[PDB]
Structure 1
Amino acid sequence: GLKALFFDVQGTLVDFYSTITREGEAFSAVRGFQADWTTVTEQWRAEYRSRLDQVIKGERPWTTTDRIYREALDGILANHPWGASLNSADRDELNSLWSKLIPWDDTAPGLARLRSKYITSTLSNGSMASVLRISKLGALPFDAILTAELVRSSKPDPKVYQLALDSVGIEAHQAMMVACHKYDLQAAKRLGFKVAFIARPFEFGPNKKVDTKPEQYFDYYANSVVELAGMLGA
């Protein structure tokens, strides 16, 4: 990280857990039902992985992640009674959430600092649509917005890390990946990137354990974007 930092978004920068469980509470109660939004979040994400692997395994073909979440919702709604009462336009509204995820309280100030010293960009699996709307809404400054949609792929596919470099015009040794997911940081480190870990102990909500162990290949390890800004001289 001597010229540009690339920031994973979901979990790393934004709280999808709180977003689905709180906004979904406004959705449920207003339709007269109560839903287990903690379970729904899980089945939706897991149903998004498996529906992504198949997208990465090569049999099921590429679609924007906004379309992946929306088809995943039809699968998991079928394992809830109330899912049947939601029409197709109800589920569009429910799916819209992923373009609305909430920042962690350190994301905006640490993004602002770092960009005062660096080129900053997203490198996320979300849609460009969602990631653009997530940053505008949450006031997150970025010099640019890149997602895996632009290469029709998915991290940890090297096509995706190459796009970071190509779109900013730098060598790997000049870039650093910022993610709370260690798989992401290995693929980047395989490819020569510098890497920073932001520990996100509540990524998946209050009752779950996450993996926040340090690791030697980590160039930096931080509990917030602001702390990472401090170790990088911003």
Structure 2
Amino acid sequence: MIRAVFFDSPGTLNSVEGHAKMHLKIMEEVLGDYPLNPKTLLDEYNKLTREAFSNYAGKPYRGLRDILEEVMRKLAEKYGFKYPENFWEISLRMSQRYGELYPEVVEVLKSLKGKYHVGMITDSGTEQAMAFLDALGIKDLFDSITTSEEAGFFKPHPRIFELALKKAGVKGEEAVYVGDNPKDAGGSKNLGMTSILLDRKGEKREFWDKADFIVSDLREVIKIVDELN
């Protein structure tokens, strides 16, 4: 019997278009009048952050601020613009204004509340995770918020999923995990959770077999849970 539904944050909640627009604005403010195409800076920032997040997957927690600040130091020395001492603050200010939930998020979270334990699991630090939820107005829609900083390890390490389950007071077999990255269908299945992969654009077909179910819209989750029960 499914008693809890956990969501991968921010990946299944924040729209890719809002993320891209928000981050483009971050780099525009970082650069100002500097003769560097902000989109090029962003592309290279994404290359470096993607590599970093890949290297730390499953490993002991390390602060994301230090990671991103070192990335921006490498980009500043590479391109010659002034290193943004306020990069973290710029990011928070731009996520508040330009962060955008997928259209169905609130509906889905509301439909699960009461019926099931609605949880969030994220590799973000706790402060960042709370600021993210606060900016998008959905902090109180979750019964639990579990972070890598609390567990001590990044996904797909089992401990972050184990902690989420213990917060909810449910067994792995009683929980679903809805995940964006094909870190998700892995650490959660190690705890006996049912793994749902969110693939909105159908661009992850190579990794579908790693998940128990594949959805393109979070509104499909409630249907899957109801069918399981």
1:126 alignment counterpart = 124
Tell me, yes or no, if the aligned pair for 2:61 and 2:148 is still in contact at 8 Å.
Answer: no
1:139 alignment counterpart = 137
1:47 alignment counterpart = 48
Residues 1:71 and 1:210: Cα distance change in structure 2 (over 3 Å)? farther
Equivalent residue of 1:210, what SS? coil
1:85 aligns with 2:78: no
Equivalent residue of 2:9, what SS? coil
Equivalent residue of 2:192, what SS? coil
Shift of 1:69: 2.3
1:215 alignment counterpart = 208
Matched residues in 1 for 2:208 and 2:56: separation? 30
1:173 alignment counterpart = 173
Matched residues in 2 for 1:152 and 1:230: separation? 33
Residues 1:72 and 1:227: Cα distance change in structure 2 (over 3 Å)? same
2:102 alignment counterpart = 104
Matched residues in 1 for 2:5 and 2:94: separation? 23
Matched residues in 2 for 1:152 and 1:69: separation? 19
2:74 alignment counterpart = 75
Shift of 1:66: 3.2
Matched residues in 1 for 2:46 and 2:23: separation? 16
Say how many residue pairs are matched. Answer: 222
Tell me, yes or no, if the aligned pair for 1:70 and 1:95 is still in contact at 8 Å.
Answer: no
Residues 1:27 and 1:54: Cα distance change in structure 2 (over 3 Å)? closer
Matched residues in 1 for 2:71 and 2:212: separation? 36
Shift of 1:196: 1.2
2:32 alignment counterpart = 31
Q: Percent identity?
A: 18
Q: Residues 9-28 of structure 1 correspond to what in structure 2 (within 5 A)?
A: 9-15=9-15, 18-22=18-22, 24-25=24-25, 28=28
Shift of 1:174: 0.8
Task: Please tell me the residue identity of whatever aligns with 1:199.
Answer: D
Shift of 1:170: 1.6
Instruction: Calculate the aligned-residue CA RMSD, in Å.
Output: 3.2
Equivalent residue of 1:6, what SS? strand
Residues 1:131 and 1:102: Cα distance change in structure 2 (over 3 Å)? farther
1:205 alignment counterpart = none
TM-score scaled by structure 1? Answer: 0.77
TM-score scaled by structure 2? Answer: 0.79
Segments of 5+ residues of structure 2 without an aligned counterpart are: none
Shift of 1:63: 2.5
Residues 1:53 and 1:179: Cα distance change in structure 2 (over 3 Å)? closer
Tell me, yes or no, if the aligned pair for 1:15 and 1:103 is still in contact at 8 Å.
Answer: yes
Shift of 1:132: 1.3
Higher alpha-carbon deviation: 183-192 or 152-161: 183-192
Shift of 1:24: 3.3
